[PDB]
Structures are given as structure tokens and as C-alpha cells.
Ligand binder design. Structure first.
Ligand SMILES: Nc1ncnc2c1ncn2[C@@H]1O[C@H](COP(=O)(O)OP(=O)(O)NP(=O)(O)O)[C@@H](O)[C@H]1O
Ligand SMILES: Nc1ncnc2c1ncn2[C@@H]1O[C@H](COP(=O)(O)OP(=O)(O)NP(=O)(O)O)[C@@H](O)[C@H]1O
Ligand SMILES: Nc1ncnc2c1ncn2[C@@H]1O[C@H](COP(=O)(O)OP(=O)(O)NP(=O)(O)O)[C@@H](O)[C@H]1O
Lengths: 639, 536, 124, 138
DNA sequence: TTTTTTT
């Protein structure tokens, strides 16, 4: 009936526009899980076009709306719309609504008030601002929606913050609730002022005495603790913590919630029903290249990457760090002698994304150490709900394992626990960037592994003092790491650049970085895969086509020779005799590799060098031996 | 000056009334002196004339006319025929602005408590006296929630207090509001007595019709409720309810984050501008950690300062190397992002190590400096989910020194790049969650033989500096060798423990920091020292 | 239960093959292990090898060139990306699994050793 | 011995089934209910035929049955250990598992061969499995 | 969550 009044304050325009009508229909469907107040709202807004006919069509539209839009709109949106359209009318009705509940409790229990009564009234008058849910440890946790005028921590506006105790709700009980409690006292006095009749004033006197005795319990600490404990069952929403940060198109920012659902990205800085808890401290401003900080950052980006196609590719790749959904299985290796600003970019992306959305991952998770997944392992919980991971450590030319490179790159499901946590499973949603100082050595030649690996070489050095006339060496800046990365305005500008590049990727292509054409990146990746094939290098170097040679070379001989070649030329490491046999089997050797009468693989002739030089001269060896015009940020949409 | 003393909220109460007075007392002699005389009659403890100096002009009516008003206050404080009450001051305040007077007095402590007492028939509960206590003591205490989810109290420390040494003009951490509990059973009891006297006055009024029975019921109920102030459970409930009123939402995360403020034994040292100043009065900067050393300005005529400067000339004979090392050690007082540098000190026998580096550590204290073990630099790193509590020993400190070498240790260059660059470091505190913090430490390692650097890349060699000591300290066998000098054991036994020597050395460090900020722009690469560069 | 992650030609202990295949103390899991290079079985035991079944796939899914060999076909990556996370596809595949369970319960008496497949026996 | 239908008492011959009130403290048990030995039972006849099949010679069959029957006693016994060897699909791993299953988790346990084969260590290390035979007779 | 014990 109260919600019926709230629906009655809605304007007729809500039946003029079909999508707004459907939104209110879906909201009411989430309220009642039926169509009785929906039918009442139909009769209130419009008893006259469809009339009684089309009521089954209205139920069909209710069923269609209830299975749509994927975002639960509920009572709070209707209450907010009634506040926006009819604020004064919104102020009343509710003012008497809880007043009546409290009056019913007072008159039906003779002024003796208990924890559940005032918990129910408090829920009726603060139910849109607080919520309770049970976490994994089995504890009831409070969440409060933060409004603009509030003693609020930085960046917490228009979001849900976690509260160890509902401190605000406690003050509400000893303040706002006390005021409505007084109104009850003023009402009782009116009845007492009314003629005594027979003994009605005697009742009012007894009811008054009991109510003034019980009015002081609102300020008692144990009573308020009991009220808050009883209100945990009324404020409880059953799917809140599980749904808390799960939409990958919504990002908490220092001035609200950024939505990248539809181009252009929108800043929600008003009331909403989206569950958002985590955030970044960066405020979102729309992209503007005339900003001095934005112009400075774009100049640095142009100076770091000289070719345009590769600059567009790395910017499209790093723009996907703002997305926390399922992305393509990719990994970018950026290799340079520590004299380029590759390291400037990764710390910048991590800083504009924050600790909730980005993290720093040590190279130990790729090189040597195994995944426990039975101990606490808090380090592997550092990429649970984040969309960006960067490797910023290289001791001395680390060799990364193929197993981890196939474990944490592909979008599967991984399982780990933490302190006071069970072995929970989550999804890999992080854009991954690894910095290489010396080299990365890929020990495999797998077709599935090499489809997910990308390489790009640094081409620009930077030096402090000398600064010669080299076209590929410029001068460093003391502030660029010490002051320009701590600055909030530079971080805001860089986040705007990232959002602009994400929008460009979603516009020119269908969000797929595979469809982005960068011939430089493809050429570099093919060159890196050719340079990382040690078997081809061994065959080219130590195996020479010996014409009319009777030398017999079983796979075992080739395996031993290649093993020495790899250990001597590449990093010394163990090898599998059988696996090596298959590897050398699958190569040019096939041409000179034949079965024996005893069914044993043998390499006809083709004498092996067995040492430096010592090669067969006969039959030689066996191993075959744009421009940015004005602005670079934008480019051909269809090259 | 603390014109409104935090130990006396009646000073704030009276300052609100003095603001409430008409501005005709502003810049005038006669009636200003009349109100000064009346206020000294009510309470002569230098409070209300100070409030007159604060709210209105102190001496605009006559420059240098302070002593005349001080003599008038003295004559008021002595035996005075006329004795003007405070009710004249309330009459003038009501005459100037009645509505403003009423609005000013509703926010007072007595009016809040009296409103509660009259509106709830003398029954007092936890939130009511918590609200009154916050009204009268809210600028001295604060509450915030830490990382473990517990409410922690903080108290601002004033000069007259049972205070741990060095805690003055800072916020000290409290597991329980020790002072608030005593205040409730003492200061609050006094105001409760004032309310009792007010109820007795309203009882002394004529009976009228039926109000006198109501007044005796109110007096009986309030006398029953007055004893609850001394009850342990009631005080616990009051303190529990006061945590929601004293709460400041972003206090702990702001607590030690300004690198230009340093807690010292006589207050807060500010190095924001040259010259550095000493805040030894009330302020709004959140400062919790401190050092026991008191800051005195640098004066070379001090015998301890002279002795320390002569010792510094003894340890480092080269002038440029001495200036560079002093500039480098002066940056240990800064806890912000500094340049990626690292100094290695190599000495054969008895040298200046463990006297100089330990002196920097002892003048900075446990919160701002630490001794670190060489296993963080030489041994291979541990798996990061293990709670390395030694790596957490450089979180909020600007100085660290290593002191152990087994036999020509080889240092891990990855740990060197991790612990020297101005970036973020991730580690797990013991029995706590894995977290990232910032590297802000100036690092010095003292060795006996050497360090082996395996790599030859530009990254590890642009952040490494080396010095070798040229002075051997052998008192008994001191030959004509110039670099050879006779030693005093006191430097390692008595002088490093002496607070005056520590104060003098801290003054030297602050002076050299200011010198670096003045001559260069705080950048230590511009310090041109050929000896250090050649040794590297 | 399924094993998928193969780094480089894993060898496997005959002890754990005996332990975690047998109905000892309670194992109720259908077990599948996939590999890309090799499984090294170091034994010749009759009791171990009778609980092992081997199948070698004959289809390679080629994306870019797509030659006209009958044993290689053009593939879309959606089967890994979109089609495995769709709830309707999951419902359809669960219906398929239930149908094949009913087929096994009807055509045979729930025993999979009674299922006759010469390809699997020849490959094993 | 606690059994699924009461207490089995083997203090005197024949063994008795206490299925009434008693003052014997008994907490642990096995799920097997005790019925007296009856060779005309079809399951008992099947098991006796299986025992005849597994061990052909009579004296070794009697010895092995006597040795396995001492698993129901939880007191001090002779220092003996049986090593049963065989080529392939034998009667082993069914008889021993049968004894373990009829005795239950409290009165019998499975031990790994790592207890015997190697890796005896300094007793700072816990060795993690030596109390698996704390109070059980098999 | 540590000690451990991973090894
Ligand atoms: N676009 C740029 N133009 C000029 N100088 C730059 C640019 N980006 C970064 N720098 C400078 O180059 C350095 C980059 O920061 P730095 O922390 O040294 O990363 P780095 O180059 O990888 N050095 P390192 O971590 O030892 O490998 C700083 O001195 C910056 O001032
Ligand atoms: N400037 C100085 N003048 C006189 N004596 C000094 C001076 N500095 C240090 N000493 C003395 O030199 C002695 C050597 O102590 P210490 O400084 O710890 O030697 P160390 O080189 O640092 N460590 P170690 O080399 O392992 O003995 C101490 O007894 C000091 O009192
Ligand atoms: N009395 C019996 N009559 C017929 N079949 C039997 C008898 N006892 C056991 N079997 C079967 O013979 C087979 C032998 O298996 P098992 O009991 O594990 O002996 P085993 O020695 O462990 N075989 P293995 O694991 O290769 O060493 C099983 O299929 C039993 O079901």
C-alpha cells in the first residue's frame, strides 16, 4: 500500500515512453515476483487505451522484461524517481509510514518496545542505504552506500563501503529514530488532552508512563547492540558479496562509476543499483589532447615508440587493462637494455589502475618455483580480481617454463586459497606484460604456445649527461619517475588516454587485438621464433651434407650431439632422449633419416662436424644457410 | 599559545560568548576594560583576556598598550570593591543578538546535558553522556579503525601530563581511553553537580500548581542516576558509544605520510622551508612516530658539535669525500622518494664504521632507521608467500645499514634493483596480508673484505657507490703514519650513548640537508666529488 | 577427474597408476589424461595395463591455410572462448551426457568392458 | 570388540555376544554384525571355497588362516611378519583387503611401503605415519 | 597464522 502510493506519485510520462515503462515494469517484477502491484500500476497510470484487453499481453511483457537487461532494478530506483519527481511528496508518506508501524507496535504492546520492533522501523527508514551479507568466514558484514555530503574517504563516493559496525546506523537510532519516537509522545499527549470519557485517559496515562520508561532504551549500548544484531536478518541480501565486483564493464573511480558498456564511456555520478565496492583513486575526465599533461604524455608515448603501427598495437594492448573480463590469450614480451621507457609505462598503468585492479608479479612465478596450491600462498592471490599484471624483475637472463606460460596465460580456471580461506577457484582476466633486460629463452617449439606470444624490441636509449647526436638516444628527466608519476593530474590524463584507446579498439575493430594489423609485430615475432629454435641452429651448424658418405647416425647419436650443442651453446639443462629423438626426427633430417634393416632410424651420410669447422665442402651443409602526420593517437580506421 | 586550552572546555565556552559580544568592544578602551574587569572577577586565570586578544583585536586601539590592560587585570584580580558577575556578560550578549545568543548556547555542553536531563526525567544513558563528553573533549582524542578491524584511540599530548619521554605535541596510541575514564569520574562529575544545583534552584521556586512534585521526582531520579558515572560497566558502555562520535575516517592512513615533518623529542621538526622550524605548540599535523632526540639549531661553537666535526674530519681525510658522505647521510632524515643510490664502505680494521652509521641510526631512532641483515642482499630470495619479517623492517624508515660480511660475499643484483629503485615493493608482514609499500630508505653497507658484482649491465652500476677508508685507528701502536691515529674507546662506548652528542649530530645532519637543498636542488648526482667517482 | 597440463613428455609412476585407478580406499571418478607428446609407462605388468585405454586423435584443426586434407578441418576459436561458457551449450551437453548414460544402461548392463570397439583395442 | 549388534567377548570359548546392559567401557566399533560360524551359510560356503582355491596346500592354508585370525586380538602378540609373494593375478589383495574391511577403520589400517623400504630419519622430522597402528590389531 | 614442514 505504501509502494502503491509511491507508484501513484509517478508522473504519467512513465506510460508515454515505452523503454521507461518497461524499466518500471521490470523493477516491479523484481519487487513482487508477480503482477498484482504491476496490474495496480497499469490501472493507475493508464486505464484507457488497451483497457481490460491486452492484459495477457501485459503479463507477456512482464515476463519478457523479467528475463532482460541483466541488471536487477528494484525498489530503490522507484523510491529515487519519486524523490526526484516529487521530493516534498516523497518526504511525507514515508515520514508517516514508519511512524504508523511504530504506533502500531506501541499501541499493541502497551508501550513496551523491544529490539525487533525498532529494528523493523529502522529497516523501513534506512533500508535503501545499508546491506548485510555473509562472507566466506561466516560473518555478517555491513555495507553502506556513500552519498556526496558525508565524512567520506577519498574516492569512495557513489559506492558501497564495508563497515565493521553500522556506526552511522547506531547514531541514526539515538538521533533520527529518537525524533520519530518524540512524535509518538506528542501524539499520546493529544489523546490525553482529549476528554477522559470513561478511562481512555487512564489508558493514555498508563501507556504514556510505559512509553517514557522505554524511550530511554534507545540510548543504551546493549539495547542498540541487540537492535543491530536483530537488523542483520532484515537488511540481509542473499547474493551481494558474490555479485560485488563482477561486472567487467563497470569501474569504480574517484568521482563515481565509469561505465564502458556503450561508447562513449559514461560517468555515473548519481544514484544507481550497480554493486560496486572496489575503486581507483583516479578521477575520470574525458579525453582531451589540448590538456598540457595529456600533450606531455602523448609526446612521451610518441618518443618511446618510433614506428606508428607498433605504437598503436601496444596502446591497444595496454588499453585492455581496464577490462576485467575474458580477453584473448596473449602475452607481450618487451625486450630492451634498460635504457628505454618501457618501465615507465608499466608502473604508470599500474598506478592509474590501483592495487585492486593491477599488481606487480615477480618472475619467480614463471622461472623456477612450482605452484603449491595447498599452502596459503598469498602471492598467487595477487591476480584474483585484477585486469593487469606486469613482470618487473630480471636477475640474469631468466628461462621461463612452458608449463606456467600455458597455465596463467590461457583463460581457464585456477584454484588457490589464502589466510582463513578455502581452496577457491577464479578466472584469469589480466592483461600480462613482461619486461626483459637480457633475454627470454623459449625452450619449446609448440604451435599452441607460440600462438599466444608477442615480442617487440626497444629501439631508443636514454642517457643523463652526454646526450650525443644519435637519433635513437635522447636525455632522461629526473622528475619523470620522481614527480610525474606521483602527480594526480598526470595519472588522470593517462587514464583518459587509456579509455580513449579502449574506445578506439572497440570502434575500429570488434574488440579483437588479433584483427589489429601491425606488420612490425608479426615480423618481430617470426624472427624471435626463428631465433628461439635451437634445433635448427644445431642442424645448420654441426650437420653438413657429406656426399657419398657411409657415416651411420642413429637418432641417439644426433640426440647426444644436439644435447652437447644445446648445453654448450644454450643454457646447460637436462634433455629427454626420446623427446629429443622425436624433435630431431621432425626436421630436415627426415630427408637424410631412414629406417635400418633392424628397424632403427639412421641418418645416411651427412657427417657431423663433431667440432668447430671440420665441415663437408661437398654438397655444402644440410641446415639452409608508416609516418605520423599531425597526431599519432588516431589513424586509418580501415588501413 | 593555546588560547582555548584543551584541558579546559569552559575557555571555549567563554570564547563563544566573547565572539557573541557586540563589536563595539572591538578597538576601544573603556567598555573593553569593563568586560575585562568583569571577566577577571568571574575567573582570573589569564583565559578571558586571552580570548579577547584572540577573537577581537589584541592591541589595535593602542599599539604597545598590552601592559596597561595587564595592570588593569592585576587590579581586578586583587581585592576589588565592585564585583561584576557573569550575568552582566550574558545580559550584554542577549542585548546584542538574542537569537544568536540562543543559537550559541544550544551547542554548549551544559545545555546538551540539561536538555537530556529534562527531556528524559533524569534518566541518563550511555549515548547522552558520550555526546556531552565529545562536546567538551573532542579536540584531544580521536578514534579510527585499523587493518585488523579494531577501534584504536589516539590522544594528543600536552606539556603538563604524565607523558612518556618525547611524546609531546604528538598523537599517542591508546588501547583504552585512559584519560577519558578518569575525566568521566572527575570533570563530568563536577558538571553533574552543577545540574543538581540548577534542579535545587528550580525546586526553590514557588509551588505554582503541580510542578513541585514533578521537580522532586526529577531530583530523585537524577540523584539515582548520578552514581552511574563511577560504575565500570556504565563507563565501558559510554566509551563504546563514544567511538562512533570521536571517529575520524582517514586518520590512520594519513598518520605518518608527510615526509617533511619529523617527530622529535621537543615537538615536530618541519623541513618544508629553509630554515627548518620547530613546532612546539598546538597544530593539526597528524604525527605519531618520533625520535628521542631534541632538535637544537646547528651551532659550531657547541663543544659536542666541535668534537663531532673534528671526529668527522678524522674519519674521512678527503674534503670532497667528506662533503659527499655528509650530503648522502643527511638525506636519511627524509622519508620520501629519493634517488636510486647505494653506498658501500670498505675498511680493513678499526675504522669509522659502526661509529658513524650507528650514530645516524641512533639519532634517527627505531621508527625512522633500522639495522638490516646481509641475507637480504646476498642469499637468494624466498618464495613471496612466506612472511619475510626482515623485509618489512624498511617500510616507513629513511635509513638502513648493513654491517656483516662472511668472506667476500656476492650480492644478489635482483635484490639490489628491488631495494634501491624508487618504486613499489611487495612483501608479507608476519601473520598478516601481503601488501605493497614504497622504498624511501638511504642505504649504507659496511664490509671488511669486498663485494662481488657478477653483472656488468648499466642498471646495477648507475646505483652503486663505493668508498674505502684510509684511516687506521690503533691507539697503543700509533706510528708517525699520518693516516694512523690514536683512538678513544669512548666514541664507541660513551659518546654514542650520550644524548647531547646525539642532539649535536642531528643538528649537523639537518644543517647538511639544508645545505644540499640550497646549493643544489636536492639532487645528489650534482655533488661533484672526484674521489668517490674514481673509487667507483 | 582430468589431467591436461603437459610441459615436456611426462613420465608417470606405476605406483600411483596402481593406487589411484583401483577401487581401494573411496574412488568414484572417471579419469581422463591428455598429452601432446608422450606418456612413459615404465612397466609391463598385466594388472596395470588392463586398466589403461589409449586413443590417438586423427584430426588437426587448421586456421589460416586450411588445406583440403580430409583429416584436417577449418576451425573457429569460439568453441574454446564463447561456446564453453554459454549456459545453453552447457545445458545441451549435459542432456547429451544423460542420454548417453541411458544408452549405456540400455544396450549393455552398465559395463563399459562389454562395449565392443576394435579401434580402441588395436590402439591400446 | 565393538560390533554392529553389540559387543563380542572372546575371553572364553565360545565367544559371546553381549546385547544387553554391561559395565564394559567400549567406544570404538566395527560395522560388521556378529553371527556365529555356520558353514551351511551360502556366503560362508563361498568364502571357504575361495580360501580353498587361493591356497591349494592344506597346511599352509591352515597356518595362514590361523595367522590372519589373530588380527581380531588387540594385545601383545608374537614377533612375526608374513611376506606373501606371487607372480600375477593371485589371491592376494582380496584376502588382506577383506580382513581390513571386516575389521574397520578403528581396528585395522593400511600402511605404505615407505615405512619399511627406506628414509629412516633423524627424529626432528615427524615421519607423519607411525601412529596409524596405534591401537589396532591389523 | 604461525610454528612448522615443505626438503
Ligand atoms: N619518454 C621519455 N623521454 C625521456 N626520458 C624518459 C622518458 N621516459 C622515461 N624517461 C627517463 O628514463 C628513465 C626511466 O625510468 P627508470 O626507472 O630508470 O626505468 P628504466 O629505464 O628501465 N631504468 P632501469 O629500471 O634500471 O632499467 C628515467 O630517468 C626517466 O626520467
Ligand atoms: N674519530 C675517532 N677518533 C678516535 N677513536 C675513534 C674514532 N672513531 C672511532 N674510534 C674508535 O675506534 C674503535 C674501533 O671501533 P669500531 O669503529 O666499531 O671499529 P670498526 O672498524 O667499525 N668495526 P671492526 O673493523 O670489525 O672492528 C672504537 O673503540 C672507537 O672508539
Ligand atoms: N577364489 C577366487 N576365485 C576366483 N577368482 C578369484 C578368487 N580370488 C580372487 N579372484 C579374482 O582374481 C583376480 C586377482 O586379483 P587380486 O585379488 O588383486 O590379486 P592380485 O595378486 O593382487 N592381482 P595383481 O594386482 O595383478 O597382483 C581378481 O579379479 C579377483 O576378483
Amino acid at each position: 500500500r505504501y509502494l502503491h502510493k509511491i507508484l501513484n506519485l509517478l508522473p504519467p510520462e512513465y506510460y508515454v515512453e515505452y523503454p521507461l515503462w518497461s524499466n518500471v515494469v521490470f523493477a516491479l517484477a523484481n519487487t513482487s515476483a508477480n503482477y498484482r502491484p504491476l496490474a495496480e500500476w497499469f490501472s493507475q497510470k493508464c486505464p484507457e487505451k488497451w483497457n481490460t484487453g491486452g492484459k495477457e499481453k501485459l503479463e507477456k511483457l512482464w515476463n519478457d522484461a523479467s528475463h532482460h537487461t541483466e541488471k536487477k532494478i528494484t525498489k530503490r530506483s522507484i523510491m529515487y524517481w519519486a524523490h526526484k519527481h516529487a521530493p516534498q511528496q516523497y518526504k511525507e508518506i514515508v515520514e508517516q509510514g514508519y511512524f504508523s508501524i511504530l504506533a502500531e507496535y506501541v499501541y499493541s504492546y502497551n508501550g513496551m518496545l523491544e529490539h525487533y520492533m525498532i529494528a523493523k522501523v529502522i529497516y523501513a527508514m534506512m533500508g535503501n542505504k545499508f546491506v548485510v551479507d555473509v562472507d566466506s568466514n561466516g560473518k555478517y558484514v555491513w555495507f553502506e552506500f556513500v552519498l556526496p555530503g558525508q565524512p567520506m574517504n577519498q574516492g569512495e563516493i557513489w559506492k558501497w563501503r564495508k563497515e565493521v559496525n553500522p556506526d552511522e546506523l547506531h547514531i541514526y537510532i539515538s538521533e533520527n529514530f529518537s525524533r520519530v519516537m518524540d512524535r509518538i509522545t506528542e501524539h499520546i499527549k493529544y489523546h490525553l488532552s482529549q476528554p477522559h470519557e470513561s478511562n481512555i485517559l487512564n489508558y493514555y496515562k498508563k501507556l504514556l508512563k510505559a512509553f517514557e520508561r522505554s524511550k530511554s532504551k534507545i540510548f543504551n549500548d546493549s539495547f542498540k547492540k541487540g537492535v543491530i544484531r536483530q537488523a542483520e536478518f532484515l537488511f540481509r541480501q542473499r547474493s551481494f558479496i558474490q555479485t560485488l565486483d563482477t561486472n567487467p564493464h563497470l569501474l569504480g573511480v574517484g568521482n563515481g562509476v565509469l561505465s564502458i558498456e556503450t561508447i562513449p564511456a559514461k560517468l555515473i555520478n548519481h544514484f544507481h543499483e550497480h554493486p560496486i565496492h572496489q575503486y581507483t583513486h583516479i578521477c575520470y575526465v574525458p579525453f582531451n589532447p589540448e590538456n598540457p599533461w595529456t600533450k606531455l604524455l602523448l609526446n612521451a608515448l610518441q618518443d618511446i615508440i618510433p614506428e606508428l603501427d607498433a605504437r598503436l598495437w601496444i596502446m591497444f594492448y595496454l588499453s585492455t587493462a581496464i577490462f576485467r573480463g575474458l580477453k584473448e590469450a596473449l602475452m607481450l614480451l618487451w625486450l630492451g637494455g634498460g635504457c628505454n621507457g618501457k618501465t615507465f609505462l608499466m608502473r604508470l598503468v599500474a598506478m592509474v589502475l590501483g592495487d585492486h585492479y593491477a599488481s606487480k608479479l615477480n618472475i619467480s612465478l614463471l622461472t623456477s618455483c612450482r605452484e603449491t596450491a595447498e599452502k596459503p600462498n598469498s602471492a598467487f592471490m595477487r591476480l584474483k580480481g585484477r585486469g593487469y599484471g606486469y613482470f618487473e624483475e630480471t636477475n640474469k637472463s631468466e628461462v621461463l617454463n612452458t608449463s606456467r606460460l600455458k597455465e596463467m596465460v590461457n583463460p581457464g580456471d585456477v584454484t588457490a586459497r589464502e589466510l582463513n580461506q578455502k581452496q577457491e577457484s577464479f578466472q584469469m582476466t589480466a592483461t600480462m606484460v613482461a619486461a626483459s633486460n637480457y633475454n627470454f629463452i623459449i625452450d619449446t617449439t609448440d604451435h599452441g604456445t607460440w600462438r599466444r606470444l608477442r615480442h617487440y624490441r626497444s629501439k631508443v636509449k636514454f642517457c643523463h649527461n652526454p646526450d650525443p647526436s644519435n637519433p635513437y638516444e635522447k636525455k632522461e628527466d629526473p622528475r619523470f619517475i620522481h614527480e610525474y608519476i606521483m602527480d594526480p593530474d598526470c595519472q588522470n590524463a593517462f587514464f583518459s588516454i587509456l579509455v580513449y584507446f579502449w574506445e578506439k579498439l572497440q570502434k575500429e575493430y570488434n574488440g579483437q587485438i588479433k584483427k589489429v594489423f601491425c606488420p612490425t609485430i608479426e615480423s618481430e615475432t617470426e624472427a624471435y621464433r626463428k631465433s628461439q629454435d635451437t634445433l635448427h641452429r644445431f642442424i645448420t651448424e654441426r650437420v653438413v651434407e657429406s656426399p657419398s658418405a657411409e657415416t651411420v647416425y642413429n637418432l641417439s647419436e644426433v640426440v647426444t650431439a644436439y644435447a652437447e650443442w644445446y648445453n654448450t651453446n644454450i643454457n646447460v639443462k637436462r634433455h629427454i632422449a626420446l623427446e629429443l629423438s622425436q624433435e630431431l626426427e621432425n626436421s630436415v633430417l627426415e630427408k637424410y633419416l631412414q629406417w635400418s634393416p633392424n628397424k632403427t632410424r639412421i641418418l645416411k651420410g651427412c657427417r657431423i662436424l663433431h667440432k668447430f669447422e671440420t665441415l663437408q665442402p661437398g654438397e655444402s651443409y644440410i641446415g639452409v644457410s608508416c609516418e605520423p602526420k599531425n597526431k599519432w593517437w588516431e589513424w586509418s580506421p580501415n588501413p | 599559545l593555546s588560547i582555548l586550552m584543551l584541558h579546559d572546555p569552559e575557555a571555549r565556552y567563554l570564547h563563544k560568548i566573547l565572539n557573541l559580544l557586540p563589536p563595539e568592544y572591538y578597538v576601544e578602551y573603556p567598555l573593553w576594560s569593563n568586560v575585562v574587569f568583569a571577566l577577571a572577577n568571574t575567573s582570573a586565570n589569564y583565559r578571558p583576556l586571552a580570548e579577547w586578544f584572540s577573537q577581537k583585536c589584541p592591541e589595535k586601539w593602542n599599539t604597545g598598550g598590552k601592559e596597561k590592560l595587564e595592570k588593569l587585570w592585576n587590579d581586578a584580580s586583587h581585592h576589588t570593591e565592585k564585583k561584576i558577575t557573569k550575568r552582566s556578560i550574558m545580559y550584554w550578549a542577549h542585548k546584542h543578538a538574542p537569537q544568536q545568543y540562543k543559537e550559541i548556547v544550544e551547542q554548549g555542553y551544559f545545555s546538551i546535558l540539561a536538555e537530556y536531563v529534562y527531556s528524559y526525567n533524569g534518566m541518563l544513558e550511555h549515548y547522552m553522556i558520550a555526546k556531552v563528553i565529545y562536546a567538551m573533549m573532542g579536540n584531544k582524542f580521536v578514534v579510527d579503525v585499523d587493518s585488523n578491524g579494531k577501534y584504536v584511540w589516539f590522544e594528543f599530548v600536552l606539556p603538563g601530563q604524565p607523558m612518556n619521554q618525547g611524546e609531546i605535541w604528538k598523537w599517542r596510541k591508546e588501547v583504552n581511553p585512559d584519560e577519558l575514564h578518569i575525566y568521566i569520574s572527575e570533570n563530568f562529575s563536577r558538571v553533574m553537580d552543577r545540574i543538581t544545583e540548577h534542579i535545587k534552584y528550580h525546586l526553590s521556586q514557588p509551588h505554582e500548581s503541580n510542578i513541585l512534585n514533578y521537580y522532586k521526582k526529577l531530583l530523585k531520579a537524577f540523584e539515582r542516576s548520578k552514581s552511574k558515572i563511577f560504575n565500570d560497566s556504565f563507563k565501558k558502555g559510554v566509551i563504546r558509544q563514544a567511538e562512533f562520535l570521536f571517529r575520524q575516517r582517514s586518520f590512520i592512513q594519513t598518520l605518518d605520510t608527510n615526509p617533511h615533518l619529523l617527530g622529535v623529542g621537543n615537538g615536530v621538526l618541519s623541513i618544508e622551508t629553509i630554515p627548518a622550524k620547530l613546532i612546539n605548540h598546538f597544530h593539526e599535523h597528524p604525527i605519531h612516530q618520533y625520535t628521542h632526540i631534541c632538535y637544537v639549531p646547528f651551532n659550531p661553537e657547541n663543544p659536542w658539535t666541535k668534537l663531532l666535526l673534528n671526529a668527522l674530519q678524522d674519519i674521512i681525510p678527503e674534503l670532497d669525500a667528506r662533503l659527499w658522505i655528509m650530503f648522502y647521510l643527511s638525506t636519511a632524515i627524509f622519508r620520501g622518494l629519493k634517488e636510486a643510490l647505494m653506498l658501500l664502505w670498505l675498511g680493513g680494521g678499526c675504522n669509522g664504521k659502526t661509529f658513524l652509521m650507528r650514530l645516524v641510526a641512533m639519532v634517527l631512532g627505531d621508527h625512522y632507521a633500522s639495522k638490516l641483515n646481509i641475507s637480504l642482499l646476498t642469499s637468494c630470495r624466498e618464495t613471496a608467500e612466506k612472511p619475510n619479517s626482515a623485509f618489512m623492517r624498511l617500510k616507513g624508515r629513511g635509513y638502513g645499514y648493513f654491517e656483516e660480511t662472511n668472506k667476500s660475499e656476492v650480492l644478489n643484483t635482483s635484490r639490489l634493483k628491488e631495494m634501491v629503485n624508487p618504486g613499489d615493493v611487495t612483501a608479507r608482514e608476519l601473520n598478516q596480508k601481503q601488501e605493497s609499500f614504497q622504498m624511501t630508505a638511504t642505504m649504507v653497507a659496511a664490509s671488511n673484505y669486498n663485494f662481488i658484482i657478477d653483472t656488468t649491465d648499466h642498471g646495477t652500476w648507475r646505483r652503486l657507490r663505493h668508498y674505502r677508508s684510509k684511516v687506521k685507528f690503533c691507539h697503543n701502536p700509533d706510528p708517525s703514519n699520518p693516516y694512523e691515529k690514536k683512538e678513544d674507546p669512548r666514541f664507541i662506548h660513551e659518546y654514542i650513548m650520550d644524548p647531547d652528542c646525539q642532539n649535536a649530530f642531528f643538528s649537523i645532519l639537518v644543517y647538511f640537508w639544508e645545505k644540499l637543498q640550497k646549493e643544489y636542488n636536492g639532487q645528489i648526482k650534482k655533488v661533484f666529488c672526484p674521489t668517490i667517482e674514481s673509487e667507483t
